Amino acid sequence: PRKGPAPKRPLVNDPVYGSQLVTQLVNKVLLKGKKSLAERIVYGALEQARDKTGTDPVITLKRALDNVKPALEVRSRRVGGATYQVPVEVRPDRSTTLALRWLVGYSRQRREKTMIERLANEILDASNGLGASVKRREDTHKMAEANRAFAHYRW
Amino acid sequence: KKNVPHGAAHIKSTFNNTIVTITDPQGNVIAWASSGHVGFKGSRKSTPFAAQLAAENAARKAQDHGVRKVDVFVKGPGSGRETAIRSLQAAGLEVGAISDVTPQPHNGVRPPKRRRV
């Protein structure tokens, strides 16, 4: 806005898994106001995550996010008759947002049948550094680390 | 296959490019790796990041000839001029005295016409 920053909304702790990271995942899965539907998908995929490791699922979730959080994004800027990308530093609570969007997004177009086994397989493949969500992490990094020459115009 | 302990590091820095040559105190070139030598083409050569990659590439190639300390003679109206001096330090050299040797005519030759850009 013209008049400075807006207050951001607090997320209440998730009752089944006592963490605000789970309730920040259910709002990315949420479509059309189906929040009790969106929580059955997230809870159901996290129960399937411990059925393939035995480990606690939110520890697997935080290992899955740490492999897909970007550190450098590649925002665009025009100067004269040419454009380029400036590598800028991702503030941390944007990197939480931008990584939860990649896990939900790249697993909606994944090859399984239901959304529970699509979301759970993307979490397990990201907590090992294998999935397509991990692939966009280094594609975001290789794009931004190919443009260090333009890191001197940071607004 | 040489050994020269103290040398001189000449830095030319224009609005288009930067050339970082390292010589002996008699003016014999030891290594010279510039900004287009490291992979850069067009207007990316004049950026300060392209300057500090050239200053590393000439420094660590001069240390293969046993150079441990350089004197710095900079010239030219470029912004890759102080990112090069702070890249010879952070490559294993001791930079010594810094001099500006930019040529200054005493109302000498006629410059080209001004650009109606």
Add this chain to the structure above:
RNA sequence: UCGGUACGGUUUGUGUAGGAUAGGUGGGAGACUGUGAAACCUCGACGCCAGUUGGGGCGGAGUCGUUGUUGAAAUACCAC
């Protein structure tokens, strides 16, 4: 001053597996210390992980492959 040629000495050699024994072939357990052993020093030689090292400086008697790989297996050591 830069080679070519005939011949001698010196030296070179690192997929993976794995002695670090790291070119082919031969057979080779005795060649191995006043020809003064090993440790220890480091004027150096090279570079791909540990130098295989022509450093010749220091020693006061092994610098053994049957085990446990490079087809695999020696490659200490000797002819080529």
Add this chain to the structure above:
RNA sequence: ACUGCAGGGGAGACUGGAAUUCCUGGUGUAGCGGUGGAAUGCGCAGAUAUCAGGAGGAACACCGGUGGCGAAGGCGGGUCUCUGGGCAGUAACUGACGCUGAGGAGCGAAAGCGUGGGGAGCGAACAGGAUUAGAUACCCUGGUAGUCCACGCCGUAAACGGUGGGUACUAGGUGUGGGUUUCCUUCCUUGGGAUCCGUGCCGUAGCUAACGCAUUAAGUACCCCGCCUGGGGAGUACGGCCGCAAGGCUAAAACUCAAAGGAAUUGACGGGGGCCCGCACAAGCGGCGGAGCAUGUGGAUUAAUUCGAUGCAACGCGAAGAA
């Protein structure tokens, strides 16, 4: 006339250092150059870079300014030689010897012309590259005349302070350039005062259509000269004069228009400036444009397809109900 004083005033000769380019040699390896972004181009046959030597040309960093000098154009590296003007003081001398000046004459930036030199860099023309609908341009890479010198021709410029010369008067304030002279003159302070000649800023009376000018007048006055008489046609034609030429000077009319102008005013606008806001962009989430149907509209058709709406701000609008 004498006595001083300041000065890029001018002409001639000699001469200095920096930088650019080229040449020769060394070191050196693969790029350099250029732009908004590139490409043409240069280079890999040893470029650019770098160090030493050499050749040549042109312009003179700092001083340097708002400052100085010159009738104007103009004038700044150094030294020497020849030379022009100005200011102040003394009041020694001459005794109105003054001012202006039609015609005329001389000087007169830059471009250009002739002959002869010289040519580093720059750079019309030209050539390639780019940009674009095109690009005979702007931007890039090259590049001839010319820019320099000697001697002549040209005689034009927004040659401007858009303000002809001479003279006398008419409040001051305030910087700065050159002198002269006064009280504690050293009160070191090179300070204040007076006065003469410049060159700036402000400002009174007065003037002006207004903007503005204002002791350096565009004020108040006198002398002489140049010029104007609506806008175009036109500073053109024809005639003459000058010129090697380009062209310069002198200079009309037919015809056509009822305006063309100057200053200021309010607005609107700007690919002007400052500040500021808005789902304007960004950051997000879900769409439309493709399918089938519904509804309105354009066009077409029909005997009639009733009329109205037509960029945002008409089009599931008037129509909250056409068998």
Add this chain to the structure above:
RNA sequence: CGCGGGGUGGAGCAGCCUGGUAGCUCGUCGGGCUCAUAACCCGAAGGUCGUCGGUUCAAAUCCGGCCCCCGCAACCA
């Protein structure tokens, strides 16, 4: 006929002498940014390394036979 090299991803070319990986460049596809994939950026497809055999544990590399081009020097009555 002798000699003297060469065939490798859609095009180009290293690796070959000296045996253990098939790579680089351009073209293409896809994505990104953008007025313009002009450029710039990332990922991938595209290969019995001319074909047969042969030698070695193992051959793009080395041997031989074959097709297929390019040179040179002849031969050309």
Add this chain to the structure above:
RNA sequence: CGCGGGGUGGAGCAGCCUGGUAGCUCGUCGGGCUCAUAACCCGAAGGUCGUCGGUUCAAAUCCGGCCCCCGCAACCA
């Protein structure tokens, strides 16, 4: 009249001695963008390959006939 080129979408050009696919550019049409038009952008459509008549299973391509267009020749008394 000789010789040798040519006729392909609305325009200008490819494709043909290499018989089995008809191509590029501008233009026309439909949609964007704009207050509107140019420029720009997306999507399409359009050709008996001059006529005829052979050859062939098959002809723009091969071979003859005509009808047009273009160029070079037409000299010695």
Add this chain to the structure above:
RNA sequence: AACAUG
């Protein structure tokens, strides 16, 4: 870069 017109 960029951009004509009424």
